[PDB]
Design a protein around this ligand. Structure first.
Ligand SMILES: Nc1nc2c(ncn2[C@@H]2O[C@H](COP(=O)(O)OP(=O)(O)OP(=O)(O)O)[C@@H](O)[C@H]2O)c(=O)[nH]1
Ligand SMILES: Nc1ncnc2c1ncn2[C@@H]1O[C@H](COP(=O)(O)OP(=O)(O)OP(=O)(O)O)[C@@H](O)[C@H]1O
Ligand SMILES: Nc1nc2c(ncn2[C@@H]2O[C@H](COP(=O)(O)OP(=O)(O)O)[C@@H](O)[C@H]2O)c(=O)[nH]1
Ligand SMILES: [Mg+2]
Lengths: 431, 430, 330
């Protein structure tokens, strides 16, 4: 299907989202004045998938940007591609919810929610063959978390037929200055499991370790990290943006990824990220790519799948190459590393190849895994959540912003049913 | 007179189409716009139009626009007439119930009308060649819906399939054991005779018989198209008999449920292997009983031959054919049907095959394709039902199909007939 | 402590569309326990052959569950089976005819007939709600305003429906009015299988509370009476457009009910009550503190043989299930 509507929410969600758009906009050959410079004819091909044809020779992204704190929209607006976003589509408040999911979901954000809905209806009814909606938000802040999930549910009540794609970023156990993040997380997961088609779980923890070990960088600076996010986020959108081989859309992705409809939390990964400029050595070819793509060291969630099995892998290759060598390299890997897949799911590895690569490279490979090990993440949030909840610590800051305690009980109740679910299909066998 | 229409459903389906149509174009002498320096047996699969443009007896169908927009962007875009190129928008997306229920019915009338306006320009229409996967969204779902509606619409007029089969090494989708069993279940009663294409076999033959190290699906379709051109050669060249699709049905079926033959094609030799380049009619007839060159990569060392037709094209003499067939009947440990005598139907067309200008095969003086009904493909069904059972046991992925219009009973019913297809393949033999 | 799910089997007659097609009568019966279909026996709690009246279904199926629910157990009665097979006839029926009325208003009366037969020291507070699951959202039936309702978890986390019309009823006659109102608000369409086809799963809940003033003890019981929709083959019903959207959600929710039934019978480690809103509202009903009777509803026409067979195997599966039954305090 054709048009995706993209929605960015919270400080992160709008910064990783602008970094996404400058990546796909360079791929589709469009500049910060909104001019199509594309040197290949194929750059304009499926342009209307992400883009709106505006008045005249201007292509504008079908992106809606939401925040309560208006300085986020200013850093986007004063960012390098600022003018490419339509200033109707800057949706801004004047406060900020303040790492409080409740002030997101019930206070400030439920005041803002309807201003947003009016602009996603407007992107929507303007689309010819609408695919569905793509939200980028946090599972840990204040804007992205409660106001995101308010969004997920509100648009989905309006459009339950089309696809709900989300890039949901997960908070780190190592860093963050914000203590209450597992509270915001548990509360979000509860809404997410009920209202998304697919959830890419984007762990800050892993992005940190991917950037610190692989690429090289020491303290966490979000502009360097957001490059690895944006490169992943280009990677999986490839098949929607550009033609090649199998799995064009998100539905044929999600249909092939999800065995049981609440298990839609996917583990991202990206290849090549080797020693820049110099290597030029070490790795180059499609099996070397397939290797890096399959590696626990190249995974973007902090759950080591060497400790919890894979259900399904969707692998998006980019460049001109051999469909046979992927068929064999996906055969090989699944034969040999069989004990890290699940026996009851036959044919575990799903492959797309697009002729177009990204810029900076000639060949690339993106991993998307529906892994049972994503439970270690739901356990980390829980064990932390239930820690604070049993002493009813910080609770008053949230219950005071509208919530019942029984909403903390219910949000926990589904996260732990989600845990039993993920623990089952780790443990399960054939017959 | 004796005209046939190719209906190309699915991305694979469509890209074997491309290669087939491009190959018929070169075969006939047809320039890539339409004009041709000559005339002759373009008759069946092409129609000459007023302005000298020779138009395919085609229908191309895709459930999004992308596969078909590459057609009308590239080469032969001016050969392919816009009415015969049919796009969708919101696809089935690997999901059989979207292709049968939800999205499929949204193009079905429209595909049938452009089929009917092409068929009503067929003086002696034989029937259809539908090319589709047993495994995809488009290919699996839209084709089974299309088969039911064509059995009501054209009835007596034949439906041949060229059907893409997944394999126990080379596979594609997770839900593909459902796609397969679901589609077959529907096709069984409706279809006529189906030439299973195993994508592993083609991949494997290209590696071992064609010495290709890096093949792409372009390379694979080049071998595929060469078996489809070999079958269709009987309508399109000069020669002896077998000029009709129904002789294929008639002579290949042991019982009509068991309507799925195996095709061999020979020689599958690379242009680069020009040392032992002088192959005989015997040589290429040996290769047709060789387990290498089987388009369906199952074990003929377990499975019995039930029925064989040999189609020779190029510099082949039928003295040479007789001699070949007698000695292949003495040499190979081939089990055969009891109720009938010895089973070979032989076709001889005088004109060699064609390669594409970059084509991988050698430009051989003679060629053969064997169409053969084997019990070997019950081995392949058995692997497929055992995968259905795995997934169905846990109920995995089934919410996406039942949640897009399907009943779970349909899975039970489908599997029950596939398990009776298993018993039909057991019972021919005892 | 552990009581099986009673799985009870009802065959209707051959309807007009069936007899005018010329369809065979495929049901053979062996005693009260077993139905034989294509020589194959399918074994149950009680089987009801075609001639069974609406009263007959009431005294054998329904009757005893009335005394148990008012002993402060929860009680679930629900009908399952493909389209036209006689679920709505069974549960609703023809409400105002004293022969044609079904389980729901017959349950209501025998509740109040029990309350008429009780001492002056038992106070009873009965509240009812009536809602439907239509296009996977919970529409309130007694109120037009609420188009989706919410699933909340209770005191010991057992789920219940928040945001509903809880009408507090005095007479059974007034309960017949909330039934009559809610029935006619319930979303019904003409299909080629049924002219009054249920397109939604309809959820009547009677929550009955009682205290004896003199004993000073309080008990509650949730009585759920679900007329389900019947998972249908698109070939048969001829469903396109909205009829299909409807069908999708129904097939979707009853595959999930099936999988929950299935998981319980095999002893699978999760038990996904969390798939559908129907499976959630049925959490107590399928493994919890309720005495649950499943009425599997069947057609005897040859046309539906395959899908009839499946409905019987759902019930053989289902009979194997026990509930974790207990007395519900207040
Ligand atoms: N032989 C052949 N197979 C191909 C071709 N390109 C892709 N395939 C494969 O054939 C199978 C795909 O079948 P399709 O019929 O394309 O599946 P489809 O119906 O397009 O699937 P959807 O996109 O879900 O609708 C997969 O195993 C592909 O790898 C091709 O040109 N020739
Ligand atoms: N046991 C029966 N005895 C006599 N008539 C019956 C019986 N069961 C059903 N019928 C007839 O069939 C008709 C339709 O039955 P009903 O609506 O209950 O089917 P249903 O199973 O609810 O269908 P759906 O799944 O579409 O809702 C009834 O209105 C009634 O007249
Ligand atoms: N990758 C990444 N994560 C960030 C960034 N900024 C903050 N984070 C973290 O990711 C989540 C962002 O939440 P957000 O919704 O942006 O917080 P809010 O805008 O302040 O409500 C939090 O858990 C932050 O610690 C960023 O630019 N990139
Ligand atoms: Mg009904």
């Amino acid at each position: 299907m054709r048009e995706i509507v993209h929605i960015q929410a919270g400080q992160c969600g709008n910064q990783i989202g602008a970094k996404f758009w400058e990546v796909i906009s360079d791929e589709h050959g469009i500049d910060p004045t909104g001019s199509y410079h594309g040197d290949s004819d194929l750059q304009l091909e499926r342009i209307n998938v992400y883009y709106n044809e505006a008045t005249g020779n201007k292509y504008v992204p079908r992106a809606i940007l939401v925040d309560l704190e208006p300085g986020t929209m200013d850093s986007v607006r004063s960012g390098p591609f600022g003018q490419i976003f339509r200033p109707d589509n800057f949706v801004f408040g004047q406060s900020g919810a303040g790492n409080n999911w409740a002030k997101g979901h019930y206070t400030e954000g439920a005041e803002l929610v309807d201003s947003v809905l009016d602009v996603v209806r407007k992107e929507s009814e303007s689309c010819d063959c609408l695919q569905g909606f793509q939200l980028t938000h946090s599972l840990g802040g204040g804007t992205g978390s409660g106001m995101g999930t308010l969004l997920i549910s509100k648009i989905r009540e309006e459009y339950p037929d089309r696809i709900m794609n989300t890039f949901s970023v997960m908070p780190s156990p190592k860093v963050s200055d914000t203590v209450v993040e597992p509270y915001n997380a548990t509360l979000s997961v509860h809404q997410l499991v009920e209202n998304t088609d697919e959830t890419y779980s984007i762990d800050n923890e892993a992005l940190y370790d991917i950037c610190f070990r692989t690429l090289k960088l020491t303290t966490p600076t979000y502009g360097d990290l957001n490059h690895l996010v944006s490169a992943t986020m280009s990677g999986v959108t490839t098949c929607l943006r550009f033609p090649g081989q199998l799995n064009a859309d998100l539905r044929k992705l999600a249909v092939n990824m999800v065995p049981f409809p609440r298990l839609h939390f996917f583990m991202p990964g990206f290849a090549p990220l080797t020693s820049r400029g110099s290597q030029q050595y070490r790795a180059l070819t499609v099996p070397e790519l397939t290797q890096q793509m399959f590696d626990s060291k190249n995974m973007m969630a902090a759950c080591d799948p060497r400790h919890g099995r894979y259900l399904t892998v969707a692998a998006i290759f980019r460049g001109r190459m051999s469909m046979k060598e992927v068929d064999e390299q996906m055969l090989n890997v699944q034969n040999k590393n069989s004990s890290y897949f699940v026996e009851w799911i036959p044919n575990n590895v799903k492959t797309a190849v697009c002729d177009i690569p990204p810029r900076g490279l000639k060949m690339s490979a993106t991993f998307i895994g529906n892994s049972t090990a994503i439970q270690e993440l739901f356990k980390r949030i829980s064990e932390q959540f239930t820690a604070m909840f049993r002493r009813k610590a910080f609770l008053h800051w949230y219950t005071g912003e509208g919530m019942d305690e029984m909403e903390f009980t219910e949000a926990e109740s589904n996260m732990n049913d989600l845990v039993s679910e993920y623990q089952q299909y780790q443990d399960a066998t054939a017959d | 007179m004796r005209e046939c229409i190719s209906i190309h459903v699915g991305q694979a389906g469509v890209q074997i189409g491309n290669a087939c149509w491009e190959l018929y174009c070169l075969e006939h002498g047809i320039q890539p716009d339409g004009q041709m320096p000559s005339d002759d047996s373009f008759n069946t699969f092409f129609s000459e139009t007023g302005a000298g443009k020779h138009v395919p007896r085609a229908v191309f169908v895709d459930l999004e626009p992308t596969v078909i927009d590459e057609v009308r962007t590239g080469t032969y875009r001016q050969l392919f007439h816009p009415e015969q190129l049919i796009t969708g928008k919101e696809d089935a997306a690997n999901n059989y119930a979207r292709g049968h229920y939800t999205i499929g019915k949204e193009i079905i009338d429209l595909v049938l009308d452009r089929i009917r306006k092409l068929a009503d320009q067929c003086t002696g229409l034989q029937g259809f060649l539908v090319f589709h996967s047993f495994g995809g969204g488009t290919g699996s779902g839209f084709t089974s819906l299309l088969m039911e509606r064509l059995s009501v619409d054209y009835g007596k007029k034949s439906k041949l399939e060229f059907s893409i089969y997944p394999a126990p090494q080379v596979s594609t989708a997770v839900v593909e054991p459902y796609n397969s069993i679901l589609t077959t279940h529907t096709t069984l009663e409706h279809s006529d005779c189906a030439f299973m294409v195993d994508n592993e076999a083609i991949y494997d033959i290209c590696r071992r018989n064609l010495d290709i190290e890096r093949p792409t699906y372009t390379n694979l379709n080049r071998l595929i198209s060469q078996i489809v051109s070999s079958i269709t050669a009987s309508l399109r060249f000069d020669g002896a008999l077998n000029v009709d699709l129904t002789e294929f049905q008639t002579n290949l079926v042991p019982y009509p449920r068991i309507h799925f033959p195996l095709a061999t094609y020979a020689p599958v030799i690379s242009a680069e292997k020009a040392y032992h380049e002088q192959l005989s009619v015997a040589e290429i007839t040996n290769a047709c009983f060789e387990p290498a060159n089987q388009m369906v990569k199952c074990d003929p060392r377990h499975g019995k031959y039930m029925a064989c037709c040999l189609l020779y094209r190029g510099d082949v003499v039928p003295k040479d054919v007789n001699a070949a067939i007698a000695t292949i009947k003495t040499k190979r440990s081939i089990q055969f049907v009891d109720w009938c005598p010895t089973g070979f139907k032989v076709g001889i067309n005088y004109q060699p095959p064609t390669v594409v200008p970059g084509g991988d095969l050698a430009k051989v003086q003679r060629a053969v394709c064997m169409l053969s009904n084997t019990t070997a493909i019950a081995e392949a069904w058995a692997r497929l039902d055992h995968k259905f059972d795995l997934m169905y046991a846990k109920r995995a992925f089934v919410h996406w199909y039942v949640g897009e219009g399907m009943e779970e009973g349909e899975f039970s019913e489908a599997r029950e007939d596939m398990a009776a297809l298993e018993k039909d393949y057991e019972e021919v033999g005892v | 402590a552990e009581s099986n799910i009673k799985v009870m089997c009802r065959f209707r007659p051959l309807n007009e569309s069936e007899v005018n097609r010329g369809d065979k009568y495929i049901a053979k019966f062996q005693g009260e326990d077993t139905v034989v279909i294509a020589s194959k026996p399918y074994a149950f709690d009680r089987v009801f052959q075609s001639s069974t009246s609406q009263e007959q279904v009431y005294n054998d199926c329904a009757k005893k569950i009335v005394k148990d629910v008012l002993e402060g157990y929860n009680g679930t009665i629900f009908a399952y089976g493909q389209t036209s097979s006689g679920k709505t006839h069974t549960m609703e029926g023809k409400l105002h005819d004293p022969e044609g009325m079904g389980i729901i208003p017959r349950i209501v009366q025998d509740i109040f007939n029990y309350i008429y037969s009780m001492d002056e020291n038992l106070e009873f507070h009965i509240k009812v709600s009536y809602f439907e699951i239509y296009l996977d959202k919970i529409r309130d039936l007694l109120d037009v305003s609420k188009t989706n309702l919410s699933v909340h978890e209770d005191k010991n986390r057992v789920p219940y429906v928040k945001g509903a019309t809880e009408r507090f009823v005095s007479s059974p006659d007034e309960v017949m009015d909330t039934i009559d109102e809610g029935k006619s608000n319930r979303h019904v369409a003409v299909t080629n299988m049924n002219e009054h086809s249920s397109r939604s799963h309809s959820i009547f809940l009677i929550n009955v509370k009682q205290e004896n003033t003199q004993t000073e003890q309080k008990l509650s019981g949730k009585l759920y009476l679900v007329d389900l929709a019947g998972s249908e083959k698109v070939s048969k019903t001829g469903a396109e457009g909205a009829v299909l959207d409807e069908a999708k959600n129904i097939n979707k929710s009853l595959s999930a009910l099936g999988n929950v039934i299935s998981a319980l019978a095999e002893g699978s480690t999760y038990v996904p009550y969390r798939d559908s809103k129907m499976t959630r509202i049925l959490q107590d009903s399928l493994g919890g503190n309720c005495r649950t009777t499943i009425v599997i509803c069947c057609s005897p026409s040859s046309y539906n043989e395959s899908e009839t067979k499946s409905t019987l195997l759902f019930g053989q599966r289902a009979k194997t299930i026990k509930n974790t039954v207990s007395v519900n305090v207040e």
